[PDB]
Amino acid sequence: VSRDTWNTKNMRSLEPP
Amino acid sequence: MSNIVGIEYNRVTNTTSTDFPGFSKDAENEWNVEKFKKDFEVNISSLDAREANFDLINIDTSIANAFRRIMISEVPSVAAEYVYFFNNTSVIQDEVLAHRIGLVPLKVDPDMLTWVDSNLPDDEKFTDENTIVLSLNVKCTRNPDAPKGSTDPKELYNNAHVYARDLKFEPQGRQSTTFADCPVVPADPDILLAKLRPGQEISLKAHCILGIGGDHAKFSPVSTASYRLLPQINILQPIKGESARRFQKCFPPGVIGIDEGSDEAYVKDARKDTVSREVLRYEEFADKVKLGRVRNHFIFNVESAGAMTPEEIFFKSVRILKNKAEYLKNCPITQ
Amino acid sequence: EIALFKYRKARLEPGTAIGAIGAQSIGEPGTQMTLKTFHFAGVASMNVT
Amino acid sequence: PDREKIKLLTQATSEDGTSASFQIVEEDHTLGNALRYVIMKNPDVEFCGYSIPHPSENLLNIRIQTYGETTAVDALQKGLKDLMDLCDVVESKFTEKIKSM
Amino acid sequence: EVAVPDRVAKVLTYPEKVTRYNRHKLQELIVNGPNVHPGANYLLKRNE
Amino acid sequence: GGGWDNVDQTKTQCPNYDTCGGESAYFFQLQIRSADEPMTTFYKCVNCGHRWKEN
Amino acid sequence: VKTAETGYMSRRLMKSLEDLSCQYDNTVRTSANGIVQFTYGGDGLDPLEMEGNAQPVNFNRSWDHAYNITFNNQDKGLLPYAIMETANEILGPLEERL
Amino acid sequence: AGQNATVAVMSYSGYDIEDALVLNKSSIDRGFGRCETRRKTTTVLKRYANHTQDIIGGMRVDENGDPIWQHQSLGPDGLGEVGMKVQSGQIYINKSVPTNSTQYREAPVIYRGPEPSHIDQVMMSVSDNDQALIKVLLRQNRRPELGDKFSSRHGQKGVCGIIVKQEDMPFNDQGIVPDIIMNPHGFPSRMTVGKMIELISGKAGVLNGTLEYGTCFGGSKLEDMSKILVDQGFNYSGKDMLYSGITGECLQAYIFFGPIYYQKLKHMVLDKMHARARGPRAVLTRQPTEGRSRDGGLRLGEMERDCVIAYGASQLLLERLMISSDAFEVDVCDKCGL
Amino acid sequence: XXXXXXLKYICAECSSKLSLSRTDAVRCKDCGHRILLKARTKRLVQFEAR
Amino acid sequence: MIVPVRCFSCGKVVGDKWESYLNLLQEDELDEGTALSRLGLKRYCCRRMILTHVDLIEKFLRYNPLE
Amino acid sequence: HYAKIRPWRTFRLNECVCTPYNADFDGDEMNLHVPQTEEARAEAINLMGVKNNLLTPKSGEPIIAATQDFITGSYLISHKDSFYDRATLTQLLSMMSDGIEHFDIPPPAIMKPYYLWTGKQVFSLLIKPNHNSPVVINLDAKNKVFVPPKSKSLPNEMSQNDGFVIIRGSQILSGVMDKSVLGDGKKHSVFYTILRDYGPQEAANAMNRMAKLCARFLGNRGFSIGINDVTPADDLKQKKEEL
Ligand SMILES: [Mg+2]
Ligand SMILES: [Mg+2]
Ligand SMILES: [Zn+2]
Ligand SMILES: [Zn+2]
Ligand SMILES: [Zn+2]
Ligand SMILES: [Zn+2]
């Protein structure tokens, strides 16, 4: 916990289909 | 009033914002950052692999509810969408079994998959960037042992219980490399998918794709994302003696304490308080206690279904709200 | 002006199926009334239907 | 260039702006309420409110009426940008708290 | 108003005669056909 | 005569309150509606003798 | 019992009163052109259009509506007789028409 | 026969007026109110006095080897394959009847369903009179949809007026979201106090881990259930402070919130939706047929005719009672009216 | 890369695997049971996981 | 029939708790309420999911036709 | 009716028009006929149209009007304890319309310490949303629960409860929005007066406005019934026992 994953992982799933 | 939601015996009062210019002659509380920036606070009470408890202090109800709604129904997650039954001779129907598999949450990281394009023919729609393939091959046989007659069906039959852990990840194409360090498993391996008897067999594979909780619940990534306004208990006049013990028994065990010496009751932890307003039915604390809720203090409790960490779920919800605002701002307005 | 306009508008229009309208206006109430005569408890009057 | 996302409703629009209805597709109470709150925090806005005309349609009509200072379109743009800035503030605070713990 | 299911609207029809005022609309409905709702199930030619 | 004192009044204002100031009504309740529907109540104003069913 | 008796009185009275319609000379006649009422209700008024208590006009509501619609604090109120002069100027053409 | 729905008794969305119920989408997604119907079709291959009998041979293919669409799920034996889906128009029993009951005329059993079914059982047997007997079981999963009927053990029935997303539902401090919302207006006139007591007793029972009793003239006392509710942090009367799911703010009234046993009734709108434009007619009267199975029309009876007359709509009378029911172009002699 | 897709009878009581030859009987061969059920189809059946 | 995977109201996974609940009731017997609380079923919706489940699949499996 | 094509399998209708049909959404099935000729279609929509038949022909009283939840929501909005800030008021008006109607916001009833509008102002805006609307309504009505004023000589709007409705120029000056002023059978009804003074279209516009407003308002406000609503008080136990 207490570790950022949004910074290091590019959010592909958040793109509009 | 004045930012405090009123908890009365028969009604709730002061439930709206009242923090805009035009509420009063003092046209204050007009929007600006560097006021919201200095006012707003985040207090993370606890963080786990699946549950997060954090406070959003000095934020509006509409924004907090937007985050909650996006977490529930707009953060994408991976769930089985199509189940292909090669063989199912169990007592559970194929549609029921497919629904159960879809409800099984998969410990596969989103943003490692691409949204399926619906405008493609079924033979070119599913790619290795779009889909996870899960196989399931279970057959029941009589156990070649001699235990006590008619015992439980665990040492009596082989593979009598089908669990979510029996769903096998089948990498396709480049998934053999990208998923090598993180093989796809169900977040809850011990989900009882099916029970079946000797001679019965389930053989299937399931295609798991990104999806939205608003579309189907199986895609929702939170077993519950919710908040609650921070309770506020105001002891207007001192309560002492046996009356203090009676007053203390009207709240959850650790909510308000009894001072030693001064002997007066005092509010020890209002965060532990569920607002049952049990004090408001006794007529001896009617003028001695005021129950409230801080309207702009939100105690968020985010519990993940298993696919992503709750902090990531919340951050994605904030990102989604920002991105829809940004996309709408960039869109040209059509006549 | 308002009163005269309302009185003029209140006149029955030619072509109206006034007989059918009256039949339904008298019979539709006849569906919500009991066949049996139900009286207030304590009237003790002659049992006129 | 999305020409179908947001539409000015010309029938529900005043002369020289200051009053307009915008139809936004594929949006619901989530964006509607937050946008309405942010817009209502604009001193020039005298009327903000949204409605989902029917549950069977992924659609949202948001109404803005201002005074003479700005137009409804400008009020909507300012509200959207302020919503983004709010989301940035929340993201920064949450990220710093997550890192610290 | 009454809300009508699209399924029963695809079978319940109105016999709209083609005039100079609605020919384009009825052409679009014929192109749509009987399987998408803003469409048509039957055509009766003038001379048939 | 009449034994209306031996009937169950109630606290209701009849529709003809613009003619008489009646706040009472002898009543009886019958379920002339279906089992899925609730019960129907009948009234009779004591100030004018005007009857009406409030359903 | 009510369900069983629904559609009986209405049907019977319908068979009786099917063909009674208002004529263009304000008479209610059978389909055989025989007069049942020389005027409907002895009034000629549609029960659907009666704002009052079986009367066409609600005088009090109409008066209040006229007062509010024509209200003007910068207007001169008539004398009691001038009100009646206006009333008898409007009514009396119609009264002596009959 | 039922399920313990989480119920919030409150006015909501305006789609719950008049017994109508508000059902939670994503409770339906998770299997709430999910049912299925199984239907059997029975055909006998009867022998005849000419030593002939019906047969179930068939399953003709196209040149590419694949069966024709009518025979997509039919199997080599001519009887539909277990597990295969049958859409409307497909054959699952390909019965051929002799033409001199040598030559066989097709009399196959064709699936006529608005929604597809799945063949889940095909039974081949004989009766006591030495005659072939084929029974096919068709199953069909059913999602609770708009218009499906529910009831709650207290005569409070109603159809689903609206299906709403979970995030649109009101929620409590723990995030509990009702599966069903029922109108408070159904209570005051029906006086089903037993339903409120059931809600409180069920809430106390779920929080206490014990199934409660609502036995006639007895059951679990209301005060003990209130004691359980208070001891677990809930209001004694089962009214919780909820937040609006669409605004997020506290609801100004406390909402009756708890579990109620809800039964899904056999009246689903999928079996009631009927619509006829034109089709089968009874030859005797040349009027549309009488049943939803035969695609019959709706009867405009004497009462509806009287209503239309009372409206004064002569042309509508003509259109409904002649033009759209039975319009015959007869030849009449002017001399003798024959 | 992409990704593509993915006459036995049963005795009602003894659960034996029957294969009915052309016009033989409708009876089980091991026991005399007269009720036979078709085995599940061997081909693929696809379902929505909803 | 068989325990639902998820709570109808919450969406919390309860299909992995049926067997542990049964073993909590049988081995080292607990009350039903404390057995539910020991499994993390805190909310009353998730509680009723397990408390009211009728395991009909075991009865159905007694009529297994593929013995 | 005018057809509106929708995705589900039911005949949906506005609950305001359930009373003439006597329908109660509990498995009720209704028959829909499509007239096939132009003359029959015009006759249907001009003689049997819902807007042309808001009054029963047996008495002339309105029969298409507010049903239960619409009445309760109207009463709760117009309740004398209802005060709304500008944001809540504008959201209420947007829900009342479809977010496509211009509203002239009147001065608030309370100007110090806060700009607060009453629910009666909300319903005044329901009747007459802006100056371009011609619906100017004047009305005196008694609510079904009307306790008289404290004194015999005192006028009717001085009732101890909000039992007398005064509307002057489409402005609700007193009295709650009730069944007797928004429901059936009353010729002092708001919708009856709008009909008789300005047309079926105006009356239907007001009714649709109210229906949308209530459908969106009751759920967000919260209205519930519980066992505590039917639990007698402790003193009633002793009083009833001895009586
Ligand atoms: Mg009923
Ligand atoms: Mg009914
Ligand atoms: Zn009276
Ligand atoms: Zn002749
Ligand atoms: Zn056998
Ligand atoms: Zn739950």
Curated annotation (Swiss-Prot), chain B:
Pfam families: RNA_pol_A_bac (PF01000), RNA_pol_L (PF01193)
Compartments where found: Nucleus, Nucleolus
PROSITE patterns the UniProt entry points to: RNA_POL_D_30KD
Record's keyword annotation contains Ribonucleoprotein: no
SUPFAM superfamilies: Insert subdomain of RNA polymerase alpha subunit (SSF56553), RBP11-like subunits of RNA polymerase (SSF55257)
SMART domains hit by this protein: RPOLD
HAMAP family registered for this protein in UniProt: RNApol_arch_Rpo3 (MF_00320)
Role description: DNA-dependent RNA polymerases catalyze the transcription of DNA into RNA using the four ribonucleoside triphosphates as substrates. Common component of RNA polymerases I (Pol I) and III (Pol III) which synthesize ribosomal RNA precursors and small RNAs, such as 5S rRNA and tRNAs, respectively. RPC40 is part of the polymerase core and may function as a clamp element that moves to open and close the cleft.
NCBIfam families given in the database record: PRK00783.1
Misc. remarks from the entry: Present with 13000 molecules/cell in log phase SD medium.
Protein name (record): DNA-directed RNA polymerases I and III subunit RPAC1
Annotated gene: RPC40
Swiss-Prot record, chain D:
GO CC, one annotated term: nucleoplasm
Stretch forming the signal peptide: none
GO biological process, one term: transcription by RNA polymerase III
Subcellular location(s) per record: Nucleus, Nucleolus
Position of the Glycyl lysine isopeptide (Lys-Gly) (interchain with G-Cter in ubiquitin) cross-link: 93
Keywords: DNA-directed RNA polymerase, Isopeptide bond, Nucleus, Phosphoprotein, Ribosome biogenesis, Transcription, Ubl conjugation
Keyword Transferase listed: no
Molecular function per GO: DNA binding; DNA-directed RNA polymerase activity; protein dimerization activity
Top-level taxonomic group: Eukaryota
Note: Present with 8680 molecules/cell in log phase SD medium.
Described purpose of this protein according to its UniProt entry: DNA-dependent RNA polymerases catalyze the transcription of DNA into RNA using the four ribonucleoside triphosphates as substrates. Common core component of RNA polymerases I and III which synthesize ribosomal RNA precursors and small RNAs, such as 5S rRNA and tRNAs, respectively.
Sequence similarity: Belongs to the archaeal Rpo11/eukaryotic RPB11/RPC19 RNA polymerase subunit family.
Subunit (UniProt): Component of the RNA polymerase I (Pol I) and RNA polymerase III (Pol III) complexes. Component of the RNA polymerase I (Pol I) complex consisting of 14 subunits: RPA135, RPA190, RPC40, RPA14, RPB5, RPO26, RPA43, RPB8, RPA12, RPB10, RPC19, RPC10, RPA49 and RPA34. The complex is composed of a horseshoe-shaped core containing ten subunits (RPA135, RPA190, RPB5, RPO26, RPB8, RPB10, RPC10, RPA12, RPC19 and RPC40) where RPA135 and RPA190 form the DNA-binding cleft.
UniProt-recorded name of the protein: DNA-directed RNA polymerases I and III subunit RPAC2
Gene that encodes it: RPC19
Residues of the full protein shown: 42 to 142 of 142
Swiss-Prot record, chain E:
Cellular location(s): Nucleus
Family per similarity comment: Belongs to the RNA polymerase beta' chain family.
Leftover remarks: Present with 6020 molecules/cell in log phase SD medium.
Assembly behavior: Component of the RNA polymerase III (Pol III) complex consisting of 17 subunits.
Function noted in UniProt: DNA-dependent RNA polymerase catalyzes the transcription of DNA into RNA using the four ribonucleoside triphosphates as substrates. Largest and catalytic core component of RNA polymerase III which synthesizes small RNAs, such as 5S rRNA and tRNAs. Forms the polymerase active center together with the second largest subunit. A single-stranded DNA template strand of the promoter is positioned within the central active site cleft of Pol III.
Name the record gives this protein: DNA-directed RNA polymerase III subunit RPC1
Organism: Saccharomyces cerevisiae (strain ATCC 204508 / S288c) (Baker's yeast)
UniProtKB/Swiss-Prot annotation, chain F:
Keyword Cell cycle set for record: no
Binding, Zn(2+) 2: 14, 20, 45, 48
Molecular function GO labels: DNA-directed RNA polymerase activity; nucleic acid binding; zinc ion binding
Zinc finger (TFIIS-type): 10-53
Main location: nucleus
UniProt-annotated location(s): Nucleus, Nucleolus
This protein's GO CC annotations: nucleolus; nucleoplasm; nucleus; RNA polymerase III complex
Keywords of the record: DNA-directed RNA polymerase, Metal-binding, Nucleus, Transcription, Zinc, Zinc-finger
Superkingdom to which the source organism belongs: Eukaryota
GO biological process: termination of RNA polymerase III transcription; transcription by RNA polymerase III; transcription initiation at RNA polymerase III promoter; tRNA transcription by RNA polymerase III
Subunit structure: Component of the RNA polymerase III (Pol III) complex consisting of 17 subunits.
Function, in words: DNA-dependent RNA polymerase catalyzes the transcription of DNA into RNA using the four ribonucleoside triphosphates as substrates. Component of RNA polymerase III which synthesizes small RNAs, such as 5S rRNA and tRNAs. Involved in Pol III transcription reinitiation and RNA cleavage during transcription termination.
Similarity comment: Belongs to the archaeal RpoM/eukaryotic RPA12/RPB9/RPC11 RNA polymerase family.
Protein name stated in the entry: DNA-directed RNA polymerase III subunit RPC10
Gene responsible for this protein: RPC11
Parent-protein residues present: 56 to 110 of 110
